[PDB]
Design a protein around this ligand. Structure first.
Ligand SMILES: *[C@@H]1O[C@H](CO)[C@@H](O[C@@H]2O[C@H](CO)[C@@H](O)[C@H](O)[C@H]2NC(C)=O)[C@H](O)[C@H]1NC(C)=O
Ligand SMILES: *[C@@H]1O[C@H](CO)[C@@H](O[C@@H]2O[C@H](CO)[C@@H](O)[C@H](O)[C@H]2NC(C)=O)[C@H](O)[C@H]1NC(C)=O
Ligand SMILES: [K+]
Ligand SMILES: [K+]
Ligand SMILES: [K+]
Ligand SMILES: [K+]
Ligand code: NA
Ligand code: NA
Ligand code: NA
Ligand code: NA
Ligand code: NA
Lengths: 316, 316
């Protein structure tokens, strides 16, 4: 696991700060922040307005989020700069108090990439609650890559990519801070997820790895978006957020919570938007960037993916 | 459309027969046969053991398949002899009753080549259910082969080929029996498929042409193999097989069926095998025969591709 200096950011501070917002507050002076990191094809509000922005507010946090442009479709490594900058800011802005990070989809990969390569944030994040994280990527992006209809970050989120290779070889498939990963065998976006084991894309060694079918039964069905928005997900997320260990606890949820529909505390109208969470993501992918190769690794990550091929050639 | 005698077989009938197998039945005495025609780089079992063999069984059919050697890599015109012989056999063996044909990839090109050039089988095929058929071939020169260093049937499936030209000029891009074509914009092997129109390689005039994204949305992703194996594909195929019209019916499927993962009725082990369909087929193509020209058209097809080039020169 890297333990030296932080890499320098490629983006200026003005740019990174512009991508961070808090509800009703400035990052420079915020009470009990939670940092929300969005999924592929979305802004922070698009991922979370119908779900964890109001739910976290009801738990007493001030939700804050990043929106790396365009819609989380550019280089995951740059998406991570937004996250690292935001944790630094929000920690300073809330009294040097550690804060939680809550993610969907790629946001969890971004969080873990940041924790792996930017040691400074490890003391600033108290826990990670990741919904449907793709730490191994997804095999399902393969045809899109072959067709050259994949955005930068979609290439990076393909199983076997240089990015996912680097994360693994740097030690990033082991939890770094207390981590809960909630995911589903029936996720239609991220696979493989079926095994309830380290083979799954969402699994981290020493983490609290919650495959919904383990709790709720193998026949249980909960999709990629539902993995973020469901009542089951709310109970698990609340467990993680409240737990003194920094991980969800099996005592905190069971069969009575195995409701895949949008969280009960959401208003009717929020439930409608939550259920429809993935539509705007699909439309952003559709209009968004597309290329025929995986973006290059930044220098700090190259040693961890020697021999993989990116846009510029083979990593040496 | 051609309307006379069937072309003579180039292969002995014993050889053709030996390539036909049914599950649990002789072709001479079979209950409700369905004939399965595999994709390039596979035998019948390799295409269908994880999918339409069990899925058709559960629908009450006896699955039967052909396995033209080696692995569907030889002349598509010879592959078609196996299909024509099998239809003749299974029609008689089911009491002189027409039977459905269900195909993947090249198998659909084979079925339509047979229906176009071998008139005797038209009255013996109840309906055709083709998954990812490449009636126009493909424009994508994939990464398996050096350009123009390819197997016989790979040449023939290249857009612009003499074979695909002949099919078109003989009238074979119009359905001959009731046909449903299920295909995907995100097919990484066969393109173009993106338009939901007669541009697409899988489209037949007067057919029931089902591009999955037209139903499911633009980021519904199923690949060339997923076109055969997905739950969405199963719902459409079941509709096609049951329909009184011989074609799938839009009433039978909709957004709720839009699951790209392997068909729900497959066991956990069959789903893993279905999701792994493509890689060993691609490896069989890589390991297979290579030549530097397209196989010659048989005499009965030449007049429909005059001016195209095969191994013996420009067709006359
Ligand atoms: C998208 O990611 C790329 C790649 O990391 C960013 O482009 C780099 O930006 C740095 C900072 O200016 C440059 O030094 C490199 O030359 C850039 N590389 C490439 C290939 O262009 C880019 O800034 C990111 N875009 C956004 C909107 O964040
Ligand atoms: C593969 O296809 C070629 C047709 O392209 C077949 O070869 C022909 O076989 C007939 C029947 O014996 C011969 O009369 C021809 O002279 C052959 N032509 C060529 C170019 O060799 C061949 O039999 C097929 N192989 C298999 C295993 O089916
Ligand atoms: K700001
Ligand atoms: K304040
Ligand atoms: K507790
Ligand atoms: K019709
Ligand atoms: Na399940
Ligand atoms: Na290039
Ligand atoms: Na094979
Ligand atoms: Na040719
Ligand atoms: Na099984």
């Amino acid at each position: 696991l890297p333990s030296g200096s932080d890499p320098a950011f490629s983006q200026p501070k003005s740019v990174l700060d512009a991508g961070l917002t808090c509800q009703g507050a400035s990052p420079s002076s915020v009470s009990k922040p939670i940092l929300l990191v969005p999924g592929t094809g979305t802004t922070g509000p698009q991922s979370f307005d119908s779900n964890w922005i109001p739910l976290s507010t009801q738990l007493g946090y001030t939700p804050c989020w990043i929106s790396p442009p365009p819609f989380m479709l550019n280089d995951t490594q740059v998406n991570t700069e937004y996250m690292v900058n935001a944790i630094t800011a929000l920690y300073a802005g809330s009294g040097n108090n550690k804060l939680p990070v809550l993610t969907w989809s790629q946001g969890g990969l971004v969080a873990q990439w940041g924790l792996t390569f930017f040691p400074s944030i490890r003391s600033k994040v108290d826990r990670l609650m990741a919904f449907a994280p793709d730490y191994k990527g997804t095999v399902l992006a393969g045809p899109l890559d072959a067709l050259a209809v994949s955005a930068p970050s979609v290439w990076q989120q393909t199983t076997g990519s240089a990015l996912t290779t680097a994360l693994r070889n740097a030690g990033g498939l082991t939890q770094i801070v207390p981590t809960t990963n909630l995911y589903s065998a029936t996720d239609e976006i991220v696979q493989p997820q079926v095994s309830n084991s380290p083979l799954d894309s969402s699994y981290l060694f020493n983490g609290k790895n919650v495959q919904a079918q383990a709790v709720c039964g193998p026949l249980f069905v909960i999709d990629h978006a539902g993995s973020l928005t469901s009542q089951f997900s709310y109970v698990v997320g609340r467990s993680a957020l409240r737990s003194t260990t920094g991980q969800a606890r099996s005592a905190d949820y069971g069969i009575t919570d195995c409701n895949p529909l949008p969280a009960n505390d959401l208003t009717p109208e929020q439930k409608v938007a939550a259920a429809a969470l993935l539509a705007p993501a699909a439309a952003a992918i559709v209009a968004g960037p597309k290329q025929n190769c995986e973006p290059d690794l930044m220098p700090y990550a190259r040693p961890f993916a020697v021999g993989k091929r990116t846009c510029s050639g083979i990593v040496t």
